[PDB]
Amino acid sequence: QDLELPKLAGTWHSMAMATNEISLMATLKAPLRVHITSLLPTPEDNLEIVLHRWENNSCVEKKVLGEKTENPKKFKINYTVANEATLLDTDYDNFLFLCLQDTTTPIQSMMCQYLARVLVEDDEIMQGFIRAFRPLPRHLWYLLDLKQMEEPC
Amino acid sequence: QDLELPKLAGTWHSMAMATNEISLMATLKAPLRVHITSLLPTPEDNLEIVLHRWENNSCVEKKVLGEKTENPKKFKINYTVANEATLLDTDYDNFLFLCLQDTTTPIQSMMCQYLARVLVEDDEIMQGFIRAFRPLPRHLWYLLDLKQMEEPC
């Protein structure tokens, strides 16, 4: 899988979220309590991320630009505590695991999101999501399993 | 599956934990941040639960007695906020899903633990654990995926 960026374009839905620092995600106010709703790769092979979150007592939409790196899965960003986004794994038509990371610390703080093209629970993929953040990131991991229009934004 | 209580006797290891209230579980001080290490059914068909937790800056062992109810999966207890324990599902030789619940509130607060006889990651069972707390408990659920001798107790 050499990453074909254009094939990630378009709408995505968050199915689950994981973090190695619960406070990044535990509340609606938390830095990385966000929901990625679309990706828009640019002609320069940069990445536009669109996300939704709760902020000042309402649902709001944010744009986050990512500059390409030597690694086609990694983009430099600036969103709250995160300075890097990672396209961890994908099959394009069904799932994408996308991480927002703070690389500045010795222990890299991180939130990864299981994104899906349609709202369909899949055991293989949910289990692959868990397996993804398992191996080398060998701390306790928290996982938030989302529900349908229960999360406000 | 009519529940054969004696077949649950003995040693268990926590593989994962889930809650519908993150604060019950988020810190080591949290009420239901506990690890069940054995079950000992009594001759009266009551249940002795042994658990381990962090408390006053060290690992400590606790005993929690459960009185039988008309339901053979449910036992009345008194541990922090929980007044009931539930044996949700099991195959006896590999897994047991055990919940500690506060039934006193309208929205039942709850921590469930994926217990295992041996330290073996299994996709089918981990996925069955998630499916278990999914259907009717239809809020956001948090899941803590544990690691080997990283958790102090």
UniProtKB/Swiss-Prot annotation, chains A, B:
Glycans are attached at E21, N56. This protein is, the main protein synthesized and secreted in the endometrium from mid-luteal phase of the menstrual cycle and during the first semester of pregnancy. Glycodelin-A is expressed in amniotic fluid, endometrium/decidua and maternal serum (at protein level). Glycodelin-F is expressed in follicular fluid, luteinized granulosa cells and the oviduct (at protein level). Glycodelin-S is expressed in seminal plasma and seminal vesicles (at protein level). Disulfide bonds join C59-C153, C99-C112. Keywords: Disulfide bond, Glycoprotein, Secreted, Signal. It comes from the Eukaryota. It holds the Pfam family Lipocalin. One of its GO terms (molecular function) is small molecule binding. CDD domains: lipocalin_beta-LG-like (cd19416). GO terms for biological process: apoptotic process; negative regulation of sperm capacitation; positive regulation of granulocyte macrophage colony-stimulating factor production; regulation of binding of sperm to zona pellucida. It is found in: Secreted. Glycodelin-A and -F are taken up by the cumulus cells in which partial deglycosylation takes place to produce glycodelin-C. The keyword Signal applies. Transmembrane segments: none annotated. Its main location: secreted. One of its GO terms (cellular component) is extracellular region. Belongs to the calycin superfamily. Lipocalin family. Glycoprotein that regulates critical steps during fertilization and also has immunomonomodulatory effects. Four glycoforms, namely glycodelin-S, -A, -F and -C have been identified in reproductive tissues that differ in glycosylation and biological activity. Glycodelin-A has contraceptive and immunosuppressive activities. Glycodelin-C stimulates binding of spermatozoa to the zona pellucida. Glycodelin-F inhibits spermatozoa-zona pellucida binding and significantly suppresses progesterone-induced acrosome reaction of spermatozoa. This is Glycodelin. It comes from Homo sapiens.
